[PDB]
Design a protein around this nucleic acid. Structure first.
Ligand SMILES: [Mg+2]
Ligand SMILES: [Mg+2]
Ligand SMILES: [Mg+2]
Ligand SMILES: [Mg+2]
Ligand SMILES: [Mg+2]
Ligand SMILES: [Mg+2]
Ligand SMILES: [Mg+2]
Ligand SMILES: [Mg+2]
Ligand SMILES: [Mg+2]
Ligand SMILES: [Mg+2]
Ligand SMILES: [Mg+2]
Ligand SMILES: [Mg+2]
Ligand SMILES: [Mg+2]
Ligand SMILES: [Mg+2]
Ligand SMILES: [Mg+2]
Ligand SMILES: [Mg+2]
Ligand SMILES: [Mg+2]
Ligand SMILES: [Mg+2]
Ligand SMILES: [Mg+2]
Ligand SMILES: [Mg+2]
Ligand SMILES: [Mg+2]
Ligand SMILES: [Mg+2]
Ligand SMILES: [Mg+2]
Ligand SMILES: [Mg+2]
Ligand SMILES: [Mg+2]
Ligand SMILES: [Mg+2]
Ligand SMILES: [Mg+2]
Ligand SMILES: [Mg+2]
Ligand SMILES: [Mg+2]
Ligand SMILES: [Mg+2]
Ligand SMILES: [Mg+2]
Ligand SMILES: [Mg+2]
Ligand SMILES: [Mg+2]
Ligand SMILES: [Mg+2]
Ligand SMILES: [Mg+2]
Ligand SMILES: [Mg+2]
Ligand SMILES: [Mg+2]
Ligand SMILES: [Mg+2]
Ligand SMILES: [Mg+2]
Ligand SMILES: [Mg+2]
Ligand SMILES: [Mg+2]
Lengths: 146, 36, 151
RNA sequence: GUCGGGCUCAUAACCCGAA
RNA sequence: UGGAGGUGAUUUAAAUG
RNA sequence: GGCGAAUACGUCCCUGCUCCUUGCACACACCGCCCGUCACUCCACCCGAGCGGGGCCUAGGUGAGGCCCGAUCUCCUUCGGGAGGUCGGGUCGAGCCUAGGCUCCGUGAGGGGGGAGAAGUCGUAACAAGGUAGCCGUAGGGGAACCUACGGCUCGAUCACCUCCU
RNA sequence: ACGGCUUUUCCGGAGUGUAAAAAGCUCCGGGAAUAAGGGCUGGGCAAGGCCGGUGGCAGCCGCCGCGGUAAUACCGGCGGCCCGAGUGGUGGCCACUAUUAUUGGGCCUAAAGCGGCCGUAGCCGGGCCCGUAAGUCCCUGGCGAAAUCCCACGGCUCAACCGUGGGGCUCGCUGGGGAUACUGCGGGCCUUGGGACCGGGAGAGGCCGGGGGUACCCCCGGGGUAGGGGUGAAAUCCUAUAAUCCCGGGGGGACCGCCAGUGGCGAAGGCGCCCGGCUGGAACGGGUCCGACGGUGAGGGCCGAAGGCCAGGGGAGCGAACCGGAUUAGAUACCCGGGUAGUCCUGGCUGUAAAGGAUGCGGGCUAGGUGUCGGGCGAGCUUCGAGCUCGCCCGGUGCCGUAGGGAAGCCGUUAAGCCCGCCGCCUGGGGAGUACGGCCGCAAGGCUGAAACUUAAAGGAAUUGGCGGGGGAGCACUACAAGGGGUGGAGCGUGCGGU
RNA sequence: GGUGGGGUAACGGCCCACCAAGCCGAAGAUCGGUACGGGCCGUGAGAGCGGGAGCCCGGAGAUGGACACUGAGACACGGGUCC
């Protein structure tokens, strides 16, 4: 490869076109300008969402860890799509019941996705029947209507 | 097909020549059904 | 480097820097013009005339004398021939290339499978078209002049 | 084919005896 | 001292964790 | 303690160990590493008979309403004319109907590979000359990794000989 | 714990404030009274090697990683750290990032130079003289609202905020004056780059016609008689219709040994028997000619190994598919005996390779040493040869190596070094060179080419070991070879498994 | 685009009659996607990259699609007509 080109004083148009052409090779730029994330996001760009619990499940941790992680299947109010959400805390799965409404938010992993030894789960429960789950797991507050 | 010489390396994969043959066999079936 | 083969040959002439004709050269300008006209009438190219003048008459190039008419310029063989009306109608290098292309084309009519020689014809015709672009730019060829082998 | 013994770090292959 | 090429050859069977 | 021999004075063929050099995708260190089909569980996707529905351009029929020019009628006039009804003609026009072509969302019998899981299964293709050196292009064949033919590359081990260098 | 003090804030009042109220502000009485949380505590990263629970379960974890009964990492107690009326969680943009590179990145081995070349637009373009004044530089007129930004001073207790002045911002437009170095434009003059031409030479460069070389296969005739062929070992196969082997003749298709050389020629793919004809390119020698006619090259065009396809020929040898004999647990193979397409010629299509120097092309510059091919020059030999030896210049082709470069392997005037250009390509690993759409092809196929989703590495150069159905050297009766005596079969002593 | 008119507050293919074949485009037309424009705002050593609700200036709209009366000014958010 010779000297980087074009360098000429009157070659502005070609230099600008070169930079524009190879910028589409950057996956960050391409996803933002084409709005690809918006096209497939079940939360539709929101930082939090509300849904209704359909069942409780358990997911195995990935190798070489061992254990069962407790989660719920949630149907979102805004569009009816179903997603899996983690329930953080010791004994937290005992405060959840079927037909209850929950508030979920991102689980906080790399690239705005999953984390840790549980790939496949992208969300976590924050509130249950409009009460903070962290309080319930610690105490300091009671889950209403039995 | 386009050239990907990295695919020819053998560590942890089967031989690319035969992968290519399998892909071409699969593409023939799709083209036949597309004609009916 | 060479225009197509990319070789870097260096052979050529090494002219010393000088202004006046040497002391040992006795010919005047009129004798030199007469010699040039006589040689051209014998049927030689402009390059051949200078070769003969150097080799046989001991005349290093005619570009050592001032033009007797125009003091702004020195003498050349083509200028001398123009002064008498015997200058070529087509520039000589273009003419020699066209002549080479005509001979090669009739060879290819009898040898259609000689592909290596055909690339030579393609390179020659590229040279011819470069020269015609230059000469039309300078006005030495008419604007309607065109190169066509079928001519 | 069944059962037992060899060979091998061990299994398969292989060798031997028997009903 | 150290290197680059060419032509010939290669005496049964022998899987696995 | 008593009695008391045979054979060899060698070799690395078998079983193994030490050292130099060389190849290595191994370091849990060859009892290493590792590939594909079929079977099971889960996720996302592609092709798709049928199946409901929406939006655009056309071509034809219809058309609330607006404007202009006419004839006549009713009621008022300050005698200038001014409100409005009925009919004729011209012209403009949202909407509506039919047909034609593309476009989009929703379900969809059946078909196809992709990714995880952990092992149900058959073999051992690649890594050492990996036990037939490996690999590229093209073509045919095979449960599966793969095999074979022509041309090419070294990103191939070992011994002998030859050539070309420093 | 004692002794004392204060009242921002708090409680109750008067005045001022206000359209009226409320806040605010000035005073008076009471009294330390009325006022601290959130996150974290294994590394990054400030802070515990303490105690009690749990025991690959529960749980933690942005990333790396913890937890398998003696947890500084999970839950809790006590301690400690950071920030503080705040402190944590989730999503987005900038920075981090020279992971978009004008300033300022990469492409031999890691992602990445089109298989090769010709050329259109564009970009980049050799020296001197004269003119112009478009680009460009300087001066000055008319403009680019206010708010927003920076500075000093002033008004609210200071500040935030607000006012008076100075500057900046909308980097853009326009009326005039001046300069001429560079770029652009017009005219003149050159020979250095490039091209043309002439001379004596070099070369498996290409096409066409003719003449040969051995070898091999088949057929006819003579001799001779029981085997030949082939493997690790065998068998199928050939042979008394006389083989293998030897001799005398006839026919056929492909291919050109030794000499042969990090030798030669060509853009690359590729090119090697001899003689004759046609034809392409290059080097050297050159006080010959033309006079910047140049570089690169989006689109576009031509060439392009093997294999494959379409028509017509040809078929010795070899040999996909296939048919038999073996090997093996199996053996759709490796080995052996046969064998269709194909390999060859003529006219077309296809456009693909580890098409690799895995290194795009042109120009200038930056120690040496030593081989070899072509041309030229000088000197000395000579059997007078188009012969031999030594030295120097130019152009090709190898090796060692200085400065410099690089992650290193290594490259190093045949650069992967310093500088002036133009074009092509790359932006973590997979999904995938796939799906969909288009163009091309008779067909096989070619060119162009995403997304959902998945994942913490993948990839490169070098180090120490271990291993190899790799090489070399050495050694041992728990190795062999040469030997002597046995154990394994019976009954019993004793130890082990199982029951 | 031209010639001759109409209409308008006014120039104009703004609309007609007649005569020509022009006009735009790989320096990206046409078509598709997204979006009110600017002063400014966030960030960065700077070169840059991203945004443009709130205040000021300009534009547009009054459930969707059409169309009129009065008036200096409207085809009128708290005025009129049809679907
Ligand atoms: Mg066994
Ligand atoms: Mg390892
Ligand atoms: Mg093994
Ligand atoms: Mg193997
Ligand atoms: Mg084997
Ligand atoms: Mg092998
Ligand atoms: Mg086969
Ligand atoms: Mg610390
Ligand atoms: Mg966290
Ligand atoms: Mg403990
Ligand atoms: Mg704790
Ligand atoms: Mg980089
Ligand atoms: Mg690469
Ligand atoms: Mg290349
Ligand atoms: Mg070119
Ligand atoms: Mg110049
Ligand atoms: Mg100026
Ligand atoms: Mg301003
Ligand atoms: Mg004050
Ligand atoms: Mg102040
Ligand atoms: Mg102010
Ligand atoms: Mg006979
Ligand atoms: Mg091109
Ligand atoms: Mg045969
Ligand atoms: Mg090659
Ligand atoms: Mg090579
Ligand atoms: Mg390449
Ligand atoms: Mg020489
Ligand atoms: Mg050469
Ligand atoms: Mg050289
Ligand atoms: Mg070197
Ligand atoms: Mg990538
Ligand atoms: Mg297609
Ligand atoms: Mg023993
Ligand atoms: Mg023995
Ligand atoms: Mg016994
Ligand atoms: Mg008019
Ligand atoms: Mg909008
Ligand atoms: Mg905008
Ligand atoms: Mg608002
Ligand atoms: Mg409303």
């Amino acid at each position: 490869p010779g000297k980087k080109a074009p360098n000429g004083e009157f070659a502005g148009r070609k230099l600008k076109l070169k930079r524009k052409k190879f910028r589409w090779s950057d996956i960050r730029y391409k996803r933002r300008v084409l709005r690809l994330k918006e096209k497939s996001d079940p939360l539709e760009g929101a930082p939090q969402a509300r849904g209704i619990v359909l069942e409780k499940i358990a997911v195995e941790a990935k190798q070489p860890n061992s254990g069962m992680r407790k989660a719920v299947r949630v149907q979102l109010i805004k569009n009816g799509k179903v997603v899996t959400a983690f329930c953080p805390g010791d004994g937290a799965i005992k405060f959840i019941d079927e037909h209850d409404e929950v508030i979920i938010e991102g689980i906080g992993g790399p690239k705005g996705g999953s984390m840790g030894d549980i790939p496949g789960i992208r969300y976590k429960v924050v509130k249950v029947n409009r009460v903070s789950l962290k309080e319930l797991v610690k105490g300091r507050k009671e889950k209403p209507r039995r | 097909m386009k050239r990907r010489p990295r695919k020819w390396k053998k560590k942890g994969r089967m031989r690319w020549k035969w992968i290519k043959k399998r892909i071409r066999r699969l593409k023939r079936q799709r083209k036949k059904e597309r004609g009916l | 480097a060479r225009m197509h083969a990319r070789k870097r040959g260096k052979s050529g002439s090494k002219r010393p820097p000088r202004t006046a004709p040497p002391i040992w050269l006795e010919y005047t300008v009129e004798d030199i013009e007469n010699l040039v006209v006589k040689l051209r009438k014998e049927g030689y190219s402009t390059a051949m005339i200078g070769t003969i003048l150097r080799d046989q008459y001991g005349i290093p190039t005619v570009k050592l004398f001032r033009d007797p008419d125009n003091p702004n310029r020195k003498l050349t063989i083509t200028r001398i021939l123009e002064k008498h009306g015997l200058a070529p109608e087509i520039p000589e290098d273009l003419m020699f290339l066209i002549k080479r292309a005509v001979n090669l084309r009739k060879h290819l009519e009898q040898h259609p499978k000689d592909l290596h020689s055909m690339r030579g014809l393609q390179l020659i015709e590229s040279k011819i078209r470069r020269l015609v672009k230059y000469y039309k730019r300078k006005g030495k060829l008419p604007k309607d002049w065109r190169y066509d082998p079928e001519q």
